[PDB]
Amino acid sequence: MEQFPKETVVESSGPKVLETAEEIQERRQEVLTRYQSFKERVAERGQKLEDSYHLQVFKRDADDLGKWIMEKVNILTDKSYEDPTNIQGKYQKHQSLEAEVQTKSRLMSELEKTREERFTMGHSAHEETKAHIEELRHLWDLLLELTLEKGDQLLR
């Protein structure tokens, strides 16, 4: 036995900390008072009338915007992995996305409304929104064409 044997320490990983009823109870009282203060802080945080959830909604649409393309692109990538023998199957996928295309456009409708939904005093933010949507539309068009493109092969 050239190697040195390790010595295991008993109750080493579990140190018994002395916590008295009064000691704990005293600490307990402090915690209760402290808790009120935390609650006090929470009330202050509550900002009354400021950033509307719509902006976040718009923010959600932006992610969804990329998300919607991502679904079609992923599925587009998916067909890449393998090519189903049945033609109707691929066509069916197109149909679901067909509603999605129309659906997404409405979001575009809502998105336009959303721009109007945005509050004033933020003209610059307007420019950022306009560019973000314009970029999405270019990408969206490609996918649309891409979707249409697959359907063409799906036709007949």
What residue segments make up the domains of the chain, in order of their start? 19-50, 51-156
CATH number of 19-50: 1.20.5.170
3-class SS string, the chain = CCCCCCCCCCCCCCCCCCCCHHHHHHHHHHHHHHHHHHHHHHHHHCCCCCCCHHHHHHHHHHHHHHHHHHHHHHHHHHHHHCCCCCHHHHHHHHHHHHHHHHHHHHHHHHHHHHHHHCCCCCHHHHHHHHHHHHHHHHHHHHHHHHHHHHHHHHCC
Pick the CATH number of 51-156 from 3.40.50.150, 1.20.58.1030, 3.40.50.980, 1.20.58.60: 1.20.58.60
User: CA–CA separation, 28 vs 19, rounded Å?
Assistant: 11
Experimental technique for the deposited model: NMR
The residue type found at 128 is E
Count the Cβ atoms, other than its own, within 10 Å of residue 22. Answer: 8
